[PDB]
Each structure stands twice: as C-alpha cells, then as structure tokens.
Design a protein around this ligand. Structure first.
Ligand SMILES: *[C@@H]1O[C@H](CO[C@@H]2O[C@@H](C)[C@@H](O)[C@@H](O)[C@@H]2O)[C@@H](O[C@@H]2O[C@H](CO)[C@@H](O[C@@H]3O[C@H](CO[C@H]4O[C@H](CO)[C@@H](O)[C@H](O[C@H]5O[C@H](CO)[C@@H](O)[C@H](O)[C@@H]5O)[C@@H]4O)[C@@H](O)[C@H](O[C@H]4O[C@H](CO)[C@@H](O)[C@H](O)[C@@H]4O)[C@@H]3O)[C@H](O)[C@H]2NC(C)=O)[C@H](O)[C@H]1NC(C)=O
Ligand SMILES: Cc1ccc([C@H]2CC[C@@H](C(=O)O)N2C(=O)CNC(=O)[C@@H](S)Cc2ccccc2)cc1
Ligand SMILES: *[C@@H]1O[C@H](CO)[C@@H](O)[C@H](O)[C@H]1NC(C)=O
Ligand SMILES: [Cl-]
Ligand SMILES: [Cl-]
Ligand SMILES: [Zn+2]
Length: 586
C-alpha cells in the first residue's frame, strides 16, 4: 500500500522527466520563432503531455492520500491528482490550447501605426515613447493606441478562455480558476494576509503619489492635473504606470545633487546584453551560489533576433527538466531596467539549479512569490550607488544626504509604485473567475480598481469594446500576478536578513551583500527545499521567523517617508484622491 505509492511516484518521476523535457523544447521553439509550423507542433506536443498527465493523474486519484504515512509521497501524489487543463474533455482541451495560443500571438504581433507612417511595436518602440516623451498628446497617442490595437483584439477570446479555465479548475476539485491559483500558496488566510500587507504600505504610497502628482502639475500644467484627484495613467513613464522610475527627472528631490543616468553610461561604455548576464552570474557566484552551466550561454536567447523572426519578447526563464539545460529568453535592451530584469531571470535559473535533484513534482519555488523574488534580492544590492560606481556607471556619492534621498526616490518609483498595481491585477481576475465581474463590465471594474488602489484615471474615456486588461502581457498569457506582490514584500525581508547575516550595520538601504558567503548559505538552504515543505519553513531558513511582513520594506524606505511627509506638509497636499470622480476635461 505504502509500497505501491512509492513505486508510483518513482514511475511518475521517470516518465515525467522525458515528457516534460520534450514539451519544453517545442514550447521554446514557438516562443523563439512564432510561425505556423512551430505553432502546430507546439499544439501537438500539448496532446502528448496531456495524455501523460491524464494517465498518471487518473492513477494518482486511486490513492486515498488519507491512508498514506510518508508525507513526501503524500504530497507528491496529492499534487499529481490535479490534472490542470488535461482534465478537460478532448474537444475543450484543443479549444483551450488554441485560445491561449491565439491570445499570446495577438498580443505579441500587435502594432500601432501613424497614418501614412511608421508602425511601432510595443518593445522597444512604444515603451521608449512612454519612458522619454514629455508631451501630453504624444504619450496619449501611444497609451491609447496600444489599448486600441492590443487590448480590444484580445476581448473576442477572453470570455471563452474564462469558461474553459474555470471548467478545468472545477474538474480538479476547485470552485473556479482563481481558487486554484490561490491554493498554490497553501495558506488559508492568504486574502486577509495580503490585504493587511497592502494596508501597511499605504502611508508610503499615498505620500509618493501626492508628491509625484504635484511634480506632474508643475510640468503638464494646472489645467491637466487635479491636485486632489487621481493621476492620468499615461504620465508615469511606463505603459501600465506599474513602475514610475522613468519620470525621475521630473521629480528629483534634490536637483542640486545630480547623478549620471545609468542607462546613458552603459551605452557610452559598450555594455552588451551578454555582459549584463555575466555580471549577474558573477554576483551569484560571489555569494558561493552556483554558476550557470556552459550550455546556458550556448542555448539562451539574450537579445531580440535580427533575422526577422516574430518572437515572444517577454523576459522568461526555462527549466528543461533534465537537471542540465536551463535558459533565459529576453529581448534585452542595454539599460538599467533590463540589467535588473536580467538579475530577476538569473534568480530563476539559480532556483532551478538548487532544486534540480528533487522529484520533478517538487521542482518549484516554496511558493510562486519565492520564485520571483530571488534575483530581485541581489538586484537591490546591485542598484546601490556604491555598487553602481564600482561598475563605473555612477560617480562617487560620499554619503551626501541629498544623494541619499535622491537614491531612495529612484528606488521608491520602482518598488513602492508597483505595490498597488501588483495587488489589483488578480483582485480583478479573481472576480472575473468567480463570476462577480462579467464581460459586460470587465473594463469598468478594471478602472474602478485602478482608481481605488493606484489612484489613476484614464486620460481618454473608455468606450464599449475596450478591454484594457488585454493590453497587459500576463492577461492574454494567463500568468498569475499576485506572485509579484508577494515577491516585492518578501524580497525586502530577504535583503534585511541577508544584510544582517553579512554583518551590515546602519541603514538597510546602504547594504550591499556582494561576496557574502554567509548570505549565500541562507539562500541556498531554502532554495534546495523547492516545493517539498510548506513555504513558512523556507521563510524561517532565510529570515529566522516564519511570516510575511512589510516591516523590512518600511524600514528600508523610512528616511524617504520622513522626507515625503515634511515635503507634502509644506505644500499642503491632500493625500489620496477625495475627488475620486475627477477625470481630464481635455
Ligand atoms: C519519505 O519518503 C521520502 C522520499 O523517499 C524517496 O523517494 C521514494 C519515492 C523512494 O524512491 C525512496 O527510496 C526515496 O528515498 C524520504 O526522503 C528521502 O530521504 C532520504 C534519506 O532517507 C534522502 O536521501 C538523501 O539524498 C541525498 C542526495 O539526494 C539526491 O542526490 C542525487 C543527486 O545528487 C539524486 O539523483 C538522488 O535521487 C534523485 O534523483 C533524481 C534527479 O533527477 C530525482 O528526480 C529523483 O526523484 C531522486 O530523488 C537524490 O535525490 C544524499 O546526500 C543523502 O545522504 C546524506 O547522508 C549521508 C550519510 O548517510 C551523507 O554522506 C550525505 O552528506 C548526506 O547528508 C541521502 O541519501 C532523500 O533525498 C529524501 N528524498 C526527498 C525527496 O526528500 C523520507 O525520508 C521518507 N520519510 C520517512 C519518515 O521514511
Ligand atoms: C525590472 C523588472 C523586474 C521584475 C519584473 C517582473 C515583475 C513585474 C512583471 C511585469 O513585467 O509585469 N515582471 C515580469 O513580467 C518579468 N518576467 C517574468 O516574471 C517571467 S519570469 C514570468 C513568465 C512569463 C511568461 C511565462 C512564464 C513566466 C519586471 C521588471
Ligand atoms: C523558424 O521557424 C521556421 C518554421 O517553423 C523554421 O523553418 C526555421 O528553421 C526556424 N528558425 C530557427 C532559427 O529555428
Ligand atoms: Cl490600463
Ligand atoms: Cl501566483
Ligand atoms: Zn520571473
């Protein structure tokens, strides 16, 4: 009985390594080369892996997990009982794979054109406009155009996607797909825990929002910025206003303490995408962690193709389930944002390598937020003025308080501004999945959350047929998003614990854990667990305690909170958006 269960997981592990490796290879080839051929074979390999999943998942459901004594075997078999999309009947499974593929393809090839003019892709062209234009109308053209061409074209698929992904979830014992996604955290109190963390960060976000709104008022004019209202969503330097770092030049706390633009110095010094990933590899090995294998450098796609191929340019990391082949796919641009993304993706590779000897069912992060967090932790050290100067990307600061507050603002525009966005994406999608939001009010309920959580308003009134969620990668690609909210909270917890392990004293935001073998050992022991234990055990190994907590993130930004409160009080800012119904008159 116990011997039958052990033999089962042994056979599942052997056969899954082969099948999953074959699937990963075919998926890699569509993603690196969107064509009709690679499309069809990807859809074919989907049927091979589904057959395997159904064979073993059906066998796994014959075990009463209640009677199994070994907890590791209990845990694997319980997981194999979830067939995911392979629970669908054959006709629905084919339709679902086709719909996912059609949504991804529609998003990846959408363009925005001038009449009798050029056509712009999202990356790099429209992203560059959002980051660098300071003209209200040119930002509006890019912001509206992308929603017109990407978002509106996803709407035709999305109701059927919702129906099929919910049906698969119900066939695996869940009430809807959002219930299935939340279950990955194995935390009954998840929704309440996340709400409490969100509320703890409101003082920082409200003060940053009010300070940035004032600066936008100065640049874009009083007729276009309501000082008691929400901020127009196209003015924050980013297509989704999810990170605000590209308008640093409009909101510098101390303009008398200017700084080299990192991106500008990288190009002046001939940085290349490969050099960016080599620096990330060196940071991991400086901690005593593992280097990426030689195979990685030969097989990864670290820059957009030059030969015309359509590709998915979205940065991602790939485990091929043989313990030796790991790869990144990134349309890397030489700038600071993509330097951080490169570290993000290398953190995934490190996790793959740390848990490669576990059964494949357990080759995942302690929870999805842990997987997204590892690389971001190291990038916090990389981003310090001290580290950037050692890369010859910044002059020496010298402890200047003005430079220090300027650095904290730059970090806040990335990290604090992202918190409400990362909260609201799946607040919206959980309610689509549970039927609270129907297709009649997809877009209206999205904007109600954009207002409630981020304090933003659309610059152009939305119309019937708009589907602005469709204009954000993770929606058509069906990638859960709450993992990034969790990641952004716990990465500061991990930074604080690793800084303490390395003996750093003084303000947390001055810490750089480069070359700390003690910090590497904390990360490695936790990453080796994979998904073999509830995630509080990995939290305990890294931080010395078992809970998610915003206290580290608050500690990191405390000098900035103090400065923002004094600055906002001086100007009499009304925090929040009491005039929440304001929208642009012109
Ligand atoms: C409950 O069951 C747990 C699982 O049992 C395991 O799976 C089932 C299905 C059967 O096959 C079992 O025979 C099998 O053991 C069980 O947890 C296991 O407990 C043992 C100890 O009793 C652990 O064994 C340790 O493994 C270390 C190395 O681990 C990996 O090393 C290889 C590569 O380096 C790897 O190949 C190997 O096998 C895995 O390979 C493939 C990779 O593709 C993978 O897919 C596959 O699933 C295999 O897992 C293995 O994983 C050793 O270092 C360690 O030796 C330690 O002690 C020595 C002194 O005696 C020291 O010299 C040395 O430094 C080490 O400290 C030891 O052999 C096993 O890792 C563990 N498995 C898991 C998943 O946790 C658990 O004990 C059971 N509980 C109870 C109460 O009985
Ligand atoms: C500078 C920086 C750092 C981190 C990110 C993360 C967090 C926000 C989110 C986004 O940009 O909105 N973001 C990605 O998207 C990165 N990329 C993936 O997280 C991949 S690893 C997820 C994936 C994609 C496709 C298939 C499977 C998994 C963005 C920017
Ligand atoms: C891209 O796809 C086409 C059609 O599937 C194929 O002939 C070609 O070899 C592929 N290119 C690469 C670089 O794999
Ligand atoms: Cl939007
Ligand atoms: Cl998630
Ligand atoms: Zn990621």
């Amino acid at each position: 009985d116990e011997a039958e269960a052990s033999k089962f997981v042994e056979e599942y592990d052997r056969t899954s390594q082969v099948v999953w490796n074959e699937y990963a290879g075919a998926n890699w080839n569509y993603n690196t080369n969107i064509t009709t051929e690679t499309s069809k074979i990807l859809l074919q390999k989907n049927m091979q892996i589904a057959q395997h999943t159904l064979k073993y998942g059906t066998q796994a459901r014959k075990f009463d997990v209640n009677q199994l004594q070994n907890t590791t075997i209990k845990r694997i078999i319980k997981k194999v009982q979830d067939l995911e999309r392979a629970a669908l009947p054959a006709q629905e499974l084919e339709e679902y794979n086709k719909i996912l593929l059609d949504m991804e393809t529609t998003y990846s090839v959408a363009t925005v054109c001038h009449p009798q003019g050029s056509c712009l892709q999202l990356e790099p062209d429209l992203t560059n406009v959002m980051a660098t234009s300071r003209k209200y109308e040119d930002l509006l053209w890019a912001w509206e155009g992308w929603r017109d061409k990407a978002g509106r074209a996803i709407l035709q698929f999305y109701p059927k996607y919702v129906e099929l992904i919910n049906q698969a979830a119900r066939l695996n014992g869940y009430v809807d797909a959002g219930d299935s996604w939340r279950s990955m955290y194995e935390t009954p109190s998840l929704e309440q825990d996340l709400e409490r963390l969100f509320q703890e960060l409101q003082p920082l976000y409200l003060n940053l929002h009010a300070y940035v709104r004032r600066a936008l008022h100065r640049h874009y004019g009083a007729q276009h910025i309501n000082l008691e209202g929400p901020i127009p969503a196209h003015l924050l330097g980013n297509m989704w206003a999810q990170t605000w770092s590209n308008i640093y030049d409009l909101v510098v706390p101390f303009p008398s303490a200017p700084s080299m633009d990192t991106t500008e110095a990288m190009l002046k010094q001939g940085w290349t995408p490969r050099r960016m990933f080599k620096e990330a590899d060196d940071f991991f090995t400086s901690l005593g962690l593992l280097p990426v294998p030689p195979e990685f450098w030969q097989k990864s796609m670290l820059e957009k193709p030059t030969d015309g191929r359509e590709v998915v340019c979205h940065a991602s990391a790939w485990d091929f389930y043989n313990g030796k082949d790991f790869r990144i796919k990134q349309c890397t641009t030489v700038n600071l944002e993509d330097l951080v993304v490169a570290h993000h993706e290398m953190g995934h590779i490190q996790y793959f390598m740390q848990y490669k000897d576990l059964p494949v069912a357990l080759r995942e992060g302690a929870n999805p937020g842990f997987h997204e967090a590892i690389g971001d932790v190291l990038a916090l050290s990389v981003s310090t003025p001290k580290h950037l100067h050692s890369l010859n990307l910044l002059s020496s600061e010298g402890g200047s308080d003005e430079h220090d507050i300027n650095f904290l603002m730059k970090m806040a525009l990335d990290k604090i501004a992202f918190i409400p966005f990362s909260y609201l994406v799946d607040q919206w999608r959980w309610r689509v999945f549970d039927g609270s939001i129907t297709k009649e009010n997809y877009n209206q309920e999205w904007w109600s959350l954009r207002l409630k959580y981020q304090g933003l308003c659309p610059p152009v009134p939305r119309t019937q047929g708009d589907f602005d969620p469709g204009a954000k990668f993770h929606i058509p690609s069906s990638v859960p998003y709450i993992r990034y909210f969790v990641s952004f909270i716990i990465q500061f917890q991990f930074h604080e614990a690793l800084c303490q392990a390395a003996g750093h004293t003084g303000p947390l935001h001055k810490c750089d854990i480069y070359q700390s073998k003690e910090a590497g050992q904390r990360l490695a022991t936790a990453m080796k667990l994979g998904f073999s234990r509830p995630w509080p055990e990995a939290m305990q190994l890294i931080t010395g305690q078992p809970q998610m907590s915003a206290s580290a993130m608050l500690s990191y930004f405390k000098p900035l909170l103090d400065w923002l409160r004094t600055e906002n009080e001086l100007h009499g800012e009304k925090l929040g958006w009491p005039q929440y119904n304001w929208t642009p008159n012109s």
